[PDB]
């Protein structure tokens, strides 16, 4: 007897990591070390039926990680008071292209100690007077933290197992020949991104495309790669940390010192991989639903900055990248058809977590010149509903609900229970 769907997930993690960094603090507080036994061991026959996209385990891992995020919001992060009005100016003393600025170095009036005293203070805002924040601002900061995803294992309790499709070619709703039962997963890293999977897991054999409803264009298409497309992101923006402890209740930072005039924040994607991978993707598409069609990739359709750009994080700052460079190639149905692609990005401090309960700020980006090298492990796509007279199919970057990213990770785990 195998009964499914039980919100019960054990956890596993730790080696050299402890506290400080918020991910490290979290894994430390919610996980115990693992053991290198796990045997799984598939048993002969025992079914061919499965369906990864109706897994409530995903929704569990999701709501868990978010609640944990609030549990991090509790101690140090400041929901108040200082965002009122900003006396900002610009470093532009001569100009072309009407650049204005995303980053501004500003002056302020700040409650320090005692009653109603102020001192002149530097403030930076990522996006002249006023302007403030809109109806919420939690400021994370904190003395000892950081933000890098840490491997988190999900395990089944006592009297429970987890079946696992080891079939390389799964239709997602369908015929699976090899079922095994593991007690604990290998350890999943919590990468929060859209459009591409960064870090994550690779396909064992070939590139695999997966959709909950290949006809319904509103449903996402998790495209998993057998190979990584490079992406190196260098944001050489510089900020010097100054945390003025002037008052007991108050804990203020001061960023925006020095210089270096770094261009925005910068990134790259490396293309050779992107050439073969995109060709092979249109190959898979044309060997699945797309039989004879020219495949075109336009950029994001529009929306919130988190939706229009590849919004991901390089250690707690929220990067937004113009994504035209990833989606600007028309793939000819007839046949297939040192330079690197350089993508324009921006660092944000003010992000909107949760629902609207509050905004989250990583206030003092420490140091400067911080490059994050990543492996493009993925694509999350939504199809542009087209016609058949166009003799072409258009595909756009979609996403937003990270639960889709977990289905893209938790695709081979379904918690089950055993009965005599």
């Amino acid at each position, epitope marked *: 007897v195998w009964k499914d769907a039980e919100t019960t997930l054990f956890c596993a993690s730790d080696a050299k990591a402890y506290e400080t960094e918020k991910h490290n603090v979290w894994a430390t507080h919610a996980c115990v070390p693992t053991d290198p036994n796990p045997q799984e061991i598939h048993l002969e026959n025992v079914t061919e039926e499965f369906n990864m996209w109706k897994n409530n385990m995903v929704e569990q891992m999701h709501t868990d990680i978010i609640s944990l995020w609030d549990q991090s919001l509790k101690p140090c992060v400041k929901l108040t008071p200082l965002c009122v009005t900003l006396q900002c100016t610009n470093v532009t003393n001569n100009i072309t292209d009407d650049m204005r600025g995303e980053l501004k170095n500003c002056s302020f009036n700040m409650t320090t100690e005692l009653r109603d005293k102020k001192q002149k203070v530097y403030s930076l805002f990522y996006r002249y007077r006023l302007i403030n924040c809109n109806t919420s601002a939690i400021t994370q900061a904190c003395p000892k933290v950081s933000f890098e995803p840490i491997p988190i294992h999900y395990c089944a309790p006592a009297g429970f197992a987890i079946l696992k499709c080891k079939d390389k070619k799964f239709n997602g709703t369908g015929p699976c020949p090899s079922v095994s039962t593991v007690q604990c997963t290998h350890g999943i890293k919590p990468v929060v991104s859209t459009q591409l999977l960064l870090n994550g897991s690779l396909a064992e054999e070939e590139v695999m495309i997966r959709s909950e409803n290949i006809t319904n264009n509103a449903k996402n298409i998790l495209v998993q790669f057998n190979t990584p497309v490079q992406i190196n992101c260098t944001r*050489p923006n510089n900020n010097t940390r100054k945390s003025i402890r002037i008052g007991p209740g108050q804990a203020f930072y001061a960023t925006g010192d020095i210089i*270096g005039d*770094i*261009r925005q924040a910068h990134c790259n994607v490396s293309k050779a991989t992107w050439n073969e991978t995109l060709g092979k993707v249109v190959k898979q598409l044309r060997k699945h639903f797309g039989n004879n069609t020219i495949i075109r990739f336009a950029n994001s359709s529009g929306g919130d900055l988190e939706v229009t750009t590849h919004s991901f994080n390089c250690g707690g700052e929220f990067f937004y990248c113009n994504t035209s460079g990833l989606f600007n190639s028309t793939w000819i149905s007839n046949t297939s058809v*040192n330079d690197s692609i*350089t993508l*324009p990005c921006r660092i944000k401090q003010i992000i909107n977590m949760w629902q609207r309960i509050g905004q989250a700020m990583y206030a003092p980006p420490i140091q400067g010149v911080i490059r994050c090298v990543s492996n493009i492990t993925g694509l999350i796509l939504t199809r542009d509903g087209g016609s058949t007279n166009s003799t072409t199919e258009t595909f756009r970057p979609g996403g937003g609900d990270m639960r889709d990213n977990w289905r893209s990770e938790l695709y081979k785990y379904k918690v089950v229970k055993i009965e005599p």
Partner: antibody
Amino acid sequence: QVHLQESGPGLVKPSETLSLTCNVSGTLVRDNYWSWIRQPLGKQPEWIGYVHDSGDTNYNPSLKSRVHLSLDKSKNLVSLRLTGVTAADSAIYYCATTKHGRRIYGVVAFKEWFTYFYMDVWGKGTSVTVSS
Amino acid sequence: TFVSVAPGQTARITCGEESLGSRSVIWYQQRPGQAPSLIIYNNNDRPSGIPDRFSGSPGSTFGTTATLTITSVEAGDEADYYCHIWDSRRPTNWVFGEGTTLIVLS
């Protein structure tokens, strides 16, 4: 192997038009930038211009009004014409396969980004003498 | 100009104006009776068939001249050498730098 062979008249009278051909094997002309370069006797090379099927084409300003570069995809060759020649145009002329590179820095240094070209496969060259 | 050196020793060749902006210098080697042939691109990158005896000076310190260094020189290195300078503050150079003749005193 990519292989270029230039041909021309060897001798041209002053005021006449010099016409040169570069026969290409081992690659298709549409898939490369092509550069004509010239080098007088006892002197350093003097380039001529670069041409691409895309239209990304440019001529040495000093020769601007007298020079024409072309690609012939059907015959897989590259051509040059230079009008109103004088003795100053006497040189060995070379056809080349021209690769493109970029110097890329941080965005803070965007004004200093630039492209450069290098000639990686040269023909054997054709000799041109203009005199009366 | 001219540069002479004994076999096994190191030769150095200077070419072009002092740098003004950021640089990409291309070096070519031309043997007697032959077409020019290359040596280096992107200041210190070599194409297929060129050994690491040949090295170019970085497109770096402002107000300096590009230099090609050849270590462990052999008689086969005897040739004319030319540079083609790309400098971010200068016009495209349509003429190569003045050449230098390397003499190997065998």
